[PDB]
Design an enzyme around this catalytic site. Sequence first.
Site, short mmCIF file in Angstrom:
data_model
loop_
_atom_site.label_atom_id
_atom_site.label_comp_id
_atom_site.label_asym_id
_atom_site.label_seq_id
_atom_site.Cartn_x
_atom_site.Cartn_y
_atom_site.Cartn_z
N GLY A 1 -12.57 6.19 19.24
CA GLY A 1 -12.26 5.72 20.27
C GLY A 1 -13.18 5.22 21.94
O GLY A 1 -12.86 5.17 23.17
N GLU B 1 -14.25 9.09 14.26
CA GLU B 1 -12.39 8.08 12.99
C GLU B 1 -12.64 6.31 13.91
O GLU B 1 -11.58 6.48 15.05
CB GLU B 1 -11.38 8.82 13.81
CG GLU B 1 -11.23 10.31 12.86
CD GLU B 1 -10.05 11.02 13.01
OE1 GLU B 1 -9.65 11.29 14.36
OE2 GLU B 1 -9.52 11.80 12.32
N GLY C 1 -11.77 3.04 15.21
CA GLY C 1 -10.31 2.12 14.59
C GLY C 1 -11.35 0.68 15.20
O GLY C 1 -11.97 0.00 14.04
N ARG C 2 -11.40 0.49 16.30
CA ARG C 2 -11.09 -1.04 17.27
C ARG C 2 -12.77 -1.39 17.19
O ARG C 2 -12.98 -2.68 17.18
CB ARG C 2 -10.76 -0.77 18.99
CG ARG C 2 -10.58 -1.29 19.66
CD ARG C 2 -10.98 -1.24 20.95
NE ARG C 2 -9.49 -0.44 21.80
CZ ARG C 2 -8.43 -0.05 21.76
NH1 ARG C 2 -8.20 -1.72 21.68
NH2 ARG C 2 -7.35 0.11 22.33
N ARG D 1 -0.19 -7.30 22.58
CA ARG D 1 -0.85 -6.56 23.11
C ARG D 1 -0.91 -6.37 25.01
O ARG D 1 -1.37 -5.59 25.64
CB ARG D 1 -2.74 -6.19 23.09
CG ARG D 1 -2.63 -5.24 21.79
CD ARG D 1 -4.41 -5.16 21.63
NE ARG D 1 -4.48 -4.11 21.99
CZ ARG D 1 -5.51 -3.87 23.04
NH1 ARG D 1 -6.58 -5.32 23.37
NH2 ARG D 1 -6.13 -2.61 24.50
N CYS E 1 10.92 -17.53 26.06
CA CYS E 1 11.21 -18.08 26.96
C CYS E 1 11.14 -16.98 27.76
O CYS E 1 12.58 -16.51 28.11
CB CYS E 1 12.29 -19.01 27.69
SG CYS E 1 11.78 -20.64 27.27
C1 LIG Z 1 -6.17 10.50 15.80
C2 LIG Z 1 -7.34 9.57 15.87
N1 LIG Z 1 -8.33 8.76 15.42
C3 LIG Z 1 -8.61 8.08 15.45
C4 LIG Z 1 -8.11 6.32 16.59
C5 LIG Z 1 -8.91 5.00 15.88
O1 LIG Z 1 -9.06 4.98 17.77
P1 LIG Z 1 -9.60 3.87 17.86
O2 LIG Z 1 -9.27 2.04 17.24
O3 LIG Z 1 -11.01 4.05 17.62
O4 LIG Z 1 -9.58 3.28 19.56
C6 LIG Z 1 -6.59 7.20 16.79
C7 LIG Z 1 -5.90 5.71 17.90
N2 LIG Z 1 -5.42 6.05 18.12
C8 LIG Z 1 -4.45 5.38 19.52
C9 LIG Z 1 -4.54 4.13 19.91
C10 LIG Z 1 -3.87 3.23 20.33
C11 LIG Z 1 -4.32 1.75 21.03
C12 LIG Z 1 -3.24 0.66 21.10
N3 LIG Z 1 -2.41 0.21 20.34
C13 LIG Z 1 -3.97 -0.52 22.27
O5 LIG Z 1 -4.63 -0.71 23.15
O6 LIG Z 1 -3.77 -1.68 21.26
C14 LIG Z 1 -6.13 8.16 16.86
O7 LIG Z 1 -5.08 8.49 17.49
#
Ligand SMILES: Cc1ncc(COP(=O)(O)O)c(C[NH2+]CCCC[C@H](N)C(=O)O)c1O
Lengths: 421, 413
Positions: A241, A277, A279-280, A316, A348
């Site tokens: 997050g 954890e 991702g982003r 997004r 469109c």
């Molecule tokens: C349990 C769990 N762990 C890690 C993450 C990764 O979060 P991040 O990528 O570090 O922010 C998640 C992710 N979950 C939901 C976020 C959705 C984002 C949305 N598609 C957007 O704004 O693009 C998680 O659930």
Amino acid sequence: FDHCFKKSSDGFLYCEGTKVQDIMETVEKRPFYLYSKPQITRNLEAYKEALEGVRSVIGYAIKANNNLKILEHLRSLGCGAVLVSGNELRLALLAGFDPTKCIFNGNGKSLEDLVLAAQEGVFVNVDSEFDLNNIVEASRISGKQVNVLLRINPDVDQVHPYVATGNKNSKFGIRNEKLQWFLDEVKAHPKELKLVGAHCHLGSTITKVDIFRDAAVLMIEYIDEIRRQGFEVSYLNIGGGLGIDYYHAGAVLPTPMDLINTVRELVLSRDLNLIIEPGRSLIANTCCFVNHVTGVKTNGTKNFIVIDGSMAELIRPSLYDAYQHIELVSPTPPEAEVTKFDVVGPVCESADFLGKDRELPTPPQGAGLVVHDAGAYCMSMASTYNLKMRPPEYWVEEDGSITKIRHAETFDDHLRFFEGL
Amino acid sequence: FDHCFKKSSDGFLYCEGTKVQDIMETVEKRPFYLYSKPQITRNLEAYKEALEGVRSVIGYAIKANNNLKILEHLRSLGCGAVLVSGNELRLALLAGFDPTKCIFNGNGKSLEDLVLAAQEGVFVNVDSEFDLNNIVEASRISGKQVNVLLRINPDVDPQVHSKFGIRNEKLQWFLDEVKAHPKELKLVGAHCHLGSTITKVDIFRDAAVLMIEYIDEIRRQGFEVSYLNIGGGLGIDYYHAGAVLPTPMDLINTVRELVLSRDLNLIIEPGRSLIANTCCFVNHVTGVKTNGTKNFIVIDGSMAELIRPSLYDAYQHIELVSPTPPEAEVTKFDVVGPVCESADFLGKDRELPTPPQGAGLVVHDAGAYCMSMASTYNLKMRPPEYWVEEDGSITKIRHAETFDDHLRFFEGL
Ligand SMILES: Cc1ncc(COP(=O)(O)O)c(C[NH2+]CCCC[C@H](N)C(=O)O)c1O
């Protein structure tokens, strides 16, 4: 601005030292996602350096981007895999992730998927009473004991409501007042469960590291109580997050180091493995969505850059009213009139837009345009809506070479679903 | 209350006299979209009946649902096709659609798509100055004259900023620009688009009245105009509250006499009204949980197969497929999928009985902008599709996507 995608003085956009115009001219004139492989390495190394001295798993959230070449690269640098589905576990195993560095989360884990999780020996979080009974039946079928973490709602509520996962009334984690019920049930299933930790995830696009510190303190109170009821706990999962700069104007944002520094002394004092954890914050800033301008038009007194790309390949902005930075790939003849554009796709409809109210030089037809920071929850959320078939993916490596890391979907990939019916 | 998916006295959900519970036992235990092929027929026949004695094209938006078997069935019944991309055009031709019953819309019609449009003899609606130049160049590349319609803007804009109207300043410029290109362009009519959901028939009548005055003037200036394309759908009762909705007859009754007086061919676009209420998203309940103030029915389906409620704040009716045990609590639920964010919801504040694990649950009116928008978010692979025929038999109209489909994108890379 620290960023792998940079506009020279000349006004040419580069990915590392490679000119995006040059790549656009060596590939099919349809939208593509372009990554910097080096920026992937840099993003992980910031977390690895931040976690020096802490026993830790860096869990790449595969949900953010499921490109097999990108997983293979993250896994070679010692990354772990966070997984929300059985296909994600399957892909994580082909990518060559270590099962003891994989964690399987979700609020609807199917029995078929928990059975794969159990036979492979991955961590499985526990989100509900029905989840627990499922993980128990999974153990029975697999004949393997399941390392579980209690996913706990800390009740911690400042982020888009569609990505708020730690708050009071989200569909995620157990009730707090029901913690004892879970500890009693786990102790009633010594064959099938081994409780090894507590799990929280607060949400996504968090830019305020205090909320991680306040969370970690509540999680250490629960791990301390669990330990005192005679459970052997090795692991705290604070989740992902952490946000990034989407605005490209020099904003100073909390680093991975700042984030770990908020829980470092508390984790060390309890001799806990930390699981993060991200991702982003590992993948988002490594990637542009590369478009061609189709034409420029005017409805009364709004102005429109119409591009070949759309909400089909990048939903997004429409889905979350999110800002991703937009700029041109090549320099404009300077007699063009810098004015405010909405950037829209070929469909469109009012939801088909990639950015609103963007001051830009009026582009010529066939001019490159990019959306920045589109490495996360962009390709992974992509549809074939309006039969805009999913784009190819390329990356730039250390040596300046360009490699395709994903075949473009064709119209034939739609007809496959109807063959013989 | 009147619908192709009905709860009977036995407390079981039926699709044209077939129990959804028995369909669920025939197909793989995963989410799937289920259609009534007969409701598709009824919906189209209602328009066809309203358009009798009027020259017309019923233009179906391939955008809302691009299932090939459903396209071929709509074509078999005399349906036209509204296109927004090259691929949708390729698919209309495969499904056997008549190119004299195809119109190609869009704010970004690529040159390459217009070339295909020009080769195949489909109408092209003109959006902008850069659209017109694109169309001419498509003609020169194809070597084929393109039949084109010009934009007319009604009174709909809730915002407030030559012999036409203050909101139609550019039309004369467009006529002159069309007259300047005789080998490449033939004007054949006028198009305009109204609000997504027409609730009042009067908004259709007024748009028609305005465009007929414009077409009269276009005809006075030497153009051979035959077509009036008034895009706009009738409303769907998404709440099954049994509300007041104008019928296709009421709509077409408002323009019938003015359109006959001018010998115009009226292209209507009822894409949503045609397929939306024919279709249920069918799920299995994974389990029931609670967090603080809210209860959750967790299903196998998700925002990956059905994003509409999340993306458009959209209500779609939800109900169980089969009777509940007597002891089951009736209480408020959010209905959510297993995808790891709070966008993953199919419905909120729904008074349902508490389903057992494995119970059938439907989201209603999932015919339009549902399967056509499906993704593989969280590698939830795309669902298969079934329809019930006239005879009550179950036929598969789309194969399920498999994991090896995701893996094929990385072969040899
Ligand atoms: C349990 C769990 N762990 C890690 C993450 C990764 O979060 P991040 O990528 O570090 O922010 C998640 C992710 N979950 C939901 C976020 C959705 C984002 C949305 N598609 C957007 O704004 O693009 C998680 O659930």
